[PDB]
């Protein structure tokens, strides 16, 4: 009776959703066709139920290119989703923000909002929104900005959580990533309650070093992000000794209206062969979470300060050990919070252990911990994007596409001003107080 | 007679209440179904004080379970010793406080407080002679803090004569389970020092320390901590739920322990606390209990008493014992720790003795110390609040629900005044 | 009444204590579980002096086991006659003294001495009328020496009136089980002559010699040596743990044997000592015991008494005997060895008689001689210390823990002064 | 709860460790896969334990050439070690100190320290360090010097014990042994608490004469040194009538900060056929230990004085016999200690007899004794090395490799000065005192 819908925009969102809903259907013992042969209700929060034993997800898969959605319709998860939700456009934004926010997406935004409204009104205790969207793709940035503005107009005060794919510092598949990123950030900065920074480069690094797989496909990154999402929602979806709802997330991890970009982290991530040879202490996994090499965003936390942290544990966990481990973490100097926030933790414990997906890469563990940490190091990352933007704007490169697709240069200048203001705010907060 | 009404706010309050009712039912010999299967009539001679005899000879606890999220409520409902609460009692909302006090006291709470007060009124009219209210809640969680303060204010409006008990789980000094807990603590303390008769401060840190060192348990689950707090509460009420050579009631404790209207914050303590193995290697005598109860390593509030003075002390024993022995022990302990007591309160040990052990044991004891050391606690919190207010961090969440800064200014000033009063009376002469 | 508290420091102290408590329990008829299964009420008439009657009718020794490495502690715990010590007593550290005195008295000991003193204080307040303390430790091992000296200093600070007993295993003259033992011996002796009432010097060499020649044992395991020292200690305390025609207490021995504040080092001795076969071929009469107890070949301290004079002598018998016989024997032995006693102390034989044999015999006897011969011992050690200090060998280990040379200078000067006093009184006239 | 980690540097260290951990796994009834079908805990001091019945060693096998470590990973002891510890470099120091201390090892020293820190923090009563490293090899000398400096910086006051392989006077497999030896000694002279001199030549001699094997492989020398190590640690790992911890070792056998080079010795060493025909008296085995032909360093003790000795017995031993034997040893004139140390012994007794490794060479004995003796004869050995160095430096031979690999000639001159100073100190201590 605490419902929460999922909205997947763009190819990244759709594939991540494939992984996430595979994970869920595995968790609650749900067959791909919605049937099912500590649990409570549990699945009601994400699965609505029809008359028969068939459950359907509360997901809205929207895209402008029918390729990936068609793959979904043809995949093993064909019987599952409500066929009306799988909204497909005709011509994708083609990595162009203007197309994804002014020209094309403007013609199916209404249908998407209609399906959203139907799903919302069929629910009673709606908690909030989960937008799964990338940052570089045109559909992702543009359509997500449009959709967030529309929802914020419609649903005045409700939780709105995003899982952006922050553009990596050195590996970029697109060429216009700075433009899409800056525009979508300038838009979503006033509507998204709490984003969730994740990058592909860091996940490549983690897969190579920790899991000992040298050649990972997007399937593996998707599985990892799905595990993170499942750990986020395990509080709603299960009985825990200290539960937490998404409103608690936005209250705890967001000190100021604008600074709401916490980065994700998960532990333990160890291969099946290395599953033994370590007992996986909860203090050990806490240390793993705080290890700068385990974060899922290519930013060294040591260059900034953790303004807030939220650690969600699951499995056979005992609160005293968590208290001891967090005390130890607070003792060390290399992990230096801001002076003005003396209490830098929210703790949540769940009774259900993480479940390993068959054919997966990780090993069956009894304890797991997902850290959502809002720090100041991420600020430097913005600088990089800013820098890129400046160069690609100093020559007015690629500007003609956006200009001719329903946008003006003054908008680019304004978004640059907004990003500069955000960087200024991060720097100002990073300093210490007097007296 | 002297029936007591139980209120449970916030998730911690509800879990503590579940364990508490388990303990009470074990005391009176009550089956999980709610029917009496006990063996001693004295169980039923005062069964009415906490229970109501429903028809067909059943018993229902006088509980009023309140929350804003149905999760923990349903957990209680499904689990054993949940099937005897009267199902109409489970008041719960849908929005959830979101760990915010503004939601828990202004926006969300304003929609359920009316139904809660209505069920309260029904239970009050049901009772013969109401004795008082005991509220079990937190101070960090939004629901607990906000809604409990609102309920306390409303009840005190509608019953300015009854007596008020609160078991508020104070935030621990070292760890911080939440991030905005200074704000919730300050606002809740403002309301409490406004309209409460007594407040039983508890920290999870001290309970961790006790379960670790004294009980020799490396795996303290929340069940055990709640079990300890439940044993403390049962010890507090057994003075009237049971006969005794020197009986006590809640009003007696309130009169004895509260010299001034504001200074009514007590730290509890329990004894004996013996590990599974280290029990048969110790003698269970009144001197042993008495000496156990006076030390920092057995105070359920994380603050050394030695840093201040005991303004007053109450001590409730159980099981068959000799009064002269207790008197001698109290005399000795008041003699040797002369610097640990306030000069201008001679003979500052209130004593009560019951006749029934808390099950399984020969004799137990409960300590309720109103000291000046707790000022440190408030000091700590106050400072934290100040810091998080100097930058106005997290301020927007609370501002967006109608509350404004001047609320925080007044609350902080009030808490500082309270600390000043504690300091003044600590060094009085 | 007159309860005695037992402290065990260092590995040797702990092993000796294990054997000692085995012996005592055998005396009072105490099962390994700690419950009494004896047959004679006199066992329980004074059972309180060393034991505490824990509830459910059990008995726990008044022991305080101290160490810095959990090894020997766990060995004691696992072995039989370990399951009755009160488990909260086993105080131990993790660093280990590393056979260093600086660690055992300044760095590592400063972290556990507080807990040790706290348990000491608890036991003291538990007792009715404290009689005194007996400390069982070494002089070579770092833990024993350092921590025992620290505990003695602290206790003497907190109880300047009680009486103090130490069973210090002095290093042997010929062999040297350690390498730095002169330093530990000198520092420990400095502390002891500062703040001890009596010190029972023992050497492993003499025990080896006794187990070899007198007992006719070619395989003396440490169990046997500890058994002998335990029998000596039991003989010392039986004068008050049991009725007697002429009873004695620890204070009596202290007054009789210690003419001057500093000169309080005693060499013990035991009798009879008969091999397994050579027993039935000898008569067990008081003259036989008395003549056995006066010879170098039965002194548990490796130094011939003939090289000096007996300043004083105490003699504690057991079992049923005739007082006139004892008096006659003491008269004869004081007559024929006139040159072996100091001129200016007439009638220098303190006598005590118990009524119970040490289990398995008709009559036994314990000798406690305060002589001047022991000066040689100190002489020896002093010289060794001097040598190892002239080159400042091994000095860096002790310097690195805060101690400096002037400590060693003062300690050596103090020991030389003590030897000078012994020499002066040996040739007094 | 008295933990002690082992660090194996270089090929010599790794093979010696193979032998040592084979011996341990045999002692405590530990299968090669960490399972196990007077004992206490005992194994806790060296074996950490995971949830299952699987125990893992506290060892850190580090090398710059992956050959030997790969052999370990492929050997029967594959399942045992925690795979993260088996740190392998890429290009070995190639018997060059500069490579092993400035160029190559500088790039994995951080990973080694990280694993060390993890293993240390997972322990509670950490006693100290066991470095198993040779003296001639480049990796051994250079990497060990670097690692000792780093650990001494990190762990301020803890036990640090080394098992060096002193370069033989006449059998030298390397050609630059004097350079590596002098450099590593000048470095480790200020950090190692107590080294442990052992040589291959003496062990060859012992194997030929006593064990009556004329053709021994490195396996046999490794087994002997493993037996010595096991006798050293039997006090920690077992219940004994007079136990002793490593701090006691460094306190007893080290009179001065610099002179801390005690040589090892073990007894009895007799073949299976000669096991009978002698009852193996404890006095007999003591005499065997003091026999100049049984020491494991090619130095005649009669040319110097035993400044200190430490005899660790194990098996069916009785203290009186030990006292008698040591008294007799003190009586004889050919064993002449220094005048200023009148007490030249530390004695330790253990209850557990030594266990013979199946397929081994020694015979099942009931009593054993390991002597660690710090004497003055070893001083002459330094002279020999010094002499060699002088010659190989008089022509500046081989200097170009070290110069071009991150080192200067002034460093060579300084190390020579330091070795001369050490020899001077040994000579000065060897003299007698006046008055
Ligand atoms: N983590 C993760 N990221 C993905 C995956 N597939 C695509 N992406 C991200 O998608 C980005 C490409 O832009 P998209 O958002 O996919 O563009 P789109 O969704 O196809 O929409 P258009 O821009 O209109 O084409 C890349 O930067 C990738 O990081 C995936 O399987 N896992
Ligand atoms: N006792 C013993 N010594 C060995 C054994 N194997 C090699 N050594 C010693 O190793 C020395 C050779 O130098 P190493 O330390 O092995 O060089 P490394 O370990 O391969 O490292 P690099 O110098 O970089 O190649 C020789 O002097 C041998 O004495 C062995 O099995 N037992
Ligand atoms: N003693 C105890 N305290 C608890 C327990 N569960 C939660 N708490 C405390 O309750 C606080 C959380 O308040 P909660 O009721 O869960 O949040 P709310 O819904 O906003 O009221 C935390 O500070 C915890 O310290 C428990 O089982 N025992
Ligand atoms: N009589 C006796 N003496 C012992 C025994 N064990 C050890 N010792 C002596 O105790 C000394 C060692 O001290 P120890 O307590 O083991 O070292 P520590 O840990 O630093 O205190 C040695 O000089 C031994 O002579 C024993 O069983 N009996
Ligand atoms: Mg696309
Ligand atoms: Mg090599």
Numbering used by the authors:
A (entry chain A), D (entry chain C): 1 to 37, 40 to 42, 47 to 441
B (entry chain B), C (entry chain D): 1 to 429
Quoted from the paper:
pmcMicrotubules (MTs) for m by self-assembly of GTP-bound αβ-tubulin heterodimers into a cylinder consisting of laterally associated linear protofilaments (pfs). During incorporation into the MT lattice, GTP hydrolysis is triggered by the catalytic glutamate in α-tubulin (E254), which becomes juxtaposed to the GTP in β-tubulin at the longitudinal interface between dimers. GTP hydrolysis has a destabilizing effect on the MT structure, and polymerization can only continue in the presence of a GTP-tubulin cap at the growing end of the MT. Here, in order to better understand the GTP conformation of MTs, we used cryo-EM to visualize MTs assembled from recombinant wild-type (wt) and mutant human tubulin in which the catalytic glutamate in α-tubulin was mutated to alanine or asparagine (E254A or E254N, respectively), making them deficient in GTP hydrolysis.
We first determined the cryo-EM structure of MTs polymerized from recombinant wt human tubulin to 3.8-Å resolution. Lattice parameters of these MTs, both undecorated and decorated with kinesin-1 motor domains, were nearly indistinguishable from previously reported GDP-MT structures assembled from mammalian brain tubulin. The dimer rise was 81.69 Å and 81.50 Å and the twist was +0.09° and +0.05, respectively, for recombinant wt human GDP-MTs and GDP-MTs from mammalian brain tubulin. However, there was additional density in the recombinant MT structure corresponding to the internal His6-tag located within the partly disordered acetylation loop of α-tubulin that includes lysine 40. This purification tag has previously been shown to have no effect on polymerization dynamics, and our current study confirms that it also does not alter lattice parameters compared to the endogenous wt mammalian MTs studied previously. By calculating displacement values between a symmetrized and an asymmetric (C1) reconstruction, we previously found that in mammalian brain GDP-MTs, the pfs at the seam break cylindrical symmetry and appear separated with respect to the rest (we see the same for recombinant, wt MTs), while this characteristic is either missing or less pronounced in the case of MTs containing nonhydrolyzable GTP analogs. The more-symmetric pf arrangement around the MT axis observed for the E254N and E254A mutant,and for GMPCPP-MTs is associated with the more-stable GTP region of MTs. On the other hand, the outward rotation of the seam-proximal pfs in GDP-MTs, both for the wt MTs described here and the previously described porcine MTs, may reflect tension buildup at the seam resulting from GTP hydrolysis.
